[PDB]
Amino acid sequence: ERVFAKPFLASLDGHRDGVNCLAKHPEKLATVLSGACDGEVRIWNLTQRNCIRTIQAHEGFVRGICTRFCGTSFFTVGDDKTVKQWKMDGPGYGDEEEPLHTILGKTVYTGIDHHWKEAVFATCGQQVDIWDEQRTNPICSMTWGFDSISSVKFNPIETFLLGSCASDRNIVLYDMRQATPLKKVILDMRTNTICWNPMEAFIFTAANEDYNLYTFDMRALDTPVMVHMDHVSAVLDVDYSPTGKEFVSASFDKSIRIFPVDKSRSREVYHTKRMQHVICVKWTSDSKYIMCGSDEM
Amino acid sequence: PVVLKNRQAEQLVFPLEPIEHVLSGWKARTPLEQEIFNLLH
């Protein structure tokens, strides 16, 4: 097993600035979407290991990208205070690609996530907003404090639930139907990203600045279920395997780790000399591959 | 109960999810079939 361990498969090139966002396609395994800090969005073919399309989506960073559950459209957010909707199919012939809709805003949204079933997306800026795809105005707004929310995620099971992280080192749980937040928990340091367990409705894992990972049961937020302690720098991103028995974490130290949910130590660690400051990581949907986005472009 | 059961399962399989049956699917587009359908209905 030690002789035959050869994890590295390929590296995809083409961004002219550091990668910041990753989104996988719900219907197709080999199609993934990425966004860089210069403002371009690229679509990749994993089987061919090449770039299919390139679009100049935003000016400044792109801060989030999410795919509609049907798979015929995706949504993006940039530093120009704009929410744009694009069509997954490429433009025909040599026609310049044109957004389906563009919404002007007053604040810079930091992330965006989509409902798993009901054609609804949420954006997180200074406040959590819930949008309908047919309305240019948000239909619901929930706020608790005066903060900069970094990320927001929809729950794949019991799809009306939400999770969030803000700048005063708290984690907030929401409820879409009743239009109110549920509960707040404050940790020692700021959490960067949150992820839901795709097999357990009440379980979620938080990537924190104190070199650690915390798994929580949302019914009993007083104490974490487990702590994961193998990283030596701030953990930036987490993603669950579709089986729900493992997750993968990226950190500011130039490595990625795989943790079992019931264990406190990592099963494996991957690293490369050319790899630096892994920013975003997505487990693939057939539970066989891991993809990471780093700032060496 | 579902989570507790799945945590103790010995094996988990992912993803989690007849001629007379075929005969029902077909419709009529031939004039013979049209006349037979019209007389029988």
Partner: peptide
Amino acid sequence: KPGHIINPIKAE
């Protein structure tokens, strides 16, 4: 199964 997309658990 090697090529099948695995979706989250749904009530049934």
